[PDB]
């Protein structure tokens, strides 16, 4: 693959993130789980149950096939086709009584940007996250870094009608120039759409900016406190000392620079390590909706 070094780096990121916060015995809710490419990371963590939900039935069927082909996974897997952002999770999980809610981890890997299509969907997504967790549980994930996106948008004069940037392996094209015309601020935290292309991975699929300050403010409203937010390059630098010995020779070699350090170079530096951030929140209190508590 032309992006093999990017894929290796981001899979290392996800190991570092998942295994930092997930504990043996945990129940994990994986929203937008895709084809199940993170099952092995949870095996290393020693979880007890994985609940994967994705709006695509085709990806769920592939996750089923992948689970059945894997050796020495000791946890129960529940896979569900359903929308995790545009509705509450209650109907989706009804046919699956084996699910052990409340859970210990909610994970959104490369998917929460789809929930930022509108305020109502961002709020529904985060309420689903908060409701599903134990106090002390964690919500973690990987999204494009809104601060890097703003850095890039700030380079364009307001006359540029469709701000676009990239390199040999990725490209971003914004729907419009409203940000620049609005004195270099988004007109709203939600619906800020761009098309995302990554060679051999994502074929011009629209997604939405996730202004991190808005994610944090909404999370706090729903009882979740920020523990960590770090661009991929800084997170990798922080965590790699713990992981070198754990990675096999082939995994290390797929991450290694010619100067002996581990990380990305060239066009993958921006596409993988600057473009994205991780995040982790902890549930600190139970959310009760305003005006929802009624007499008798
Ligand atoms: N901006 C953006 N990037 C994405 C999204 N989904 C995946 N990516 C990027 O595409 C890369 C490749 O993801 P995948 O195509 O699923 O490849 P993979 O990680 O090897 O997954 P598997 O083949 O299923 O094991 C990721 O590491 C991200 O950089 C998305 O929704 N938005
Ligand atoms: N509203 C939604 N509800 C549930 N899943 C969704 C929704 N919108 C998009 N998705 C899924 O989100 C996934 C996005 C992928 N980029 C990420 C998959 C996987 N978590 C990974 O890390 O590779 C796809 O599998 C989509 O089908």
Author numbering: 141 to 436
Question: Paper's wording?
Answer:
The antibiotic sinefungin (SFG) is a SAM analog in which the S-CH3 sulfonium moiety of SAM is replaced by a C-NH2 amine. Available evidence indicates that the antifungal activity of SFG is exerted via inhibition of fungal cap methyltransferase Abd1. Crystal structures of K. lactis and S. cerevisiae Abd1 as binary complexes with SAH or SFG and ternary complexes with GTP•SFG highlight how SFG makes two hydrogen bonds from its C-NH2 amine to the guanine-O6 and -N7 atoms of GTP that account for its higher affinity vis-à-vis SAH and SAM.
We co-crystallized a ScAbd1Δ119•SFG•GTP ternary complex by preincubating the protein with 0.7 mM SFG and 1 mM GTP. The structure was refined at 1.45 Å resolution with Rwork/Rfree of 12.7/15.2. No interpretable electron density was seen for the N-terminal segment of either protomer (aa 120–140). In the methyl donor site of ScAbd1, SFG interacts with a similar ensemble of conserved residues as seen in KlAbd1. In the ScAbd1•SFG•GTP ternary complex, the C-NH2 amine of SFG makes hydrogen bonds to the guanine-O6 (3.0 Å) and -N7 (2.8 Å) atoms of GTP and also to the backbone carbonyl of Phe250 (2.8 Å). The GTP guanosine in the ScAbd1 methyl acceptor site interacts with a set of conserved residues analogous to the contacts observed in the KlAbd1•SFG•GTP ternary complex. The electron density maps highlighted two alternate conformations for the triphosphate moiety of GTP, entailing different direct and water-mediated contact with surrounding positively charged side chains and the SFG amine and carboxylate groups. The conformational heterogeneity of the GTP may stem from the fact that it lacks the 5′ nucleotides of GpppRNA, the physiological substrate for Abd1.
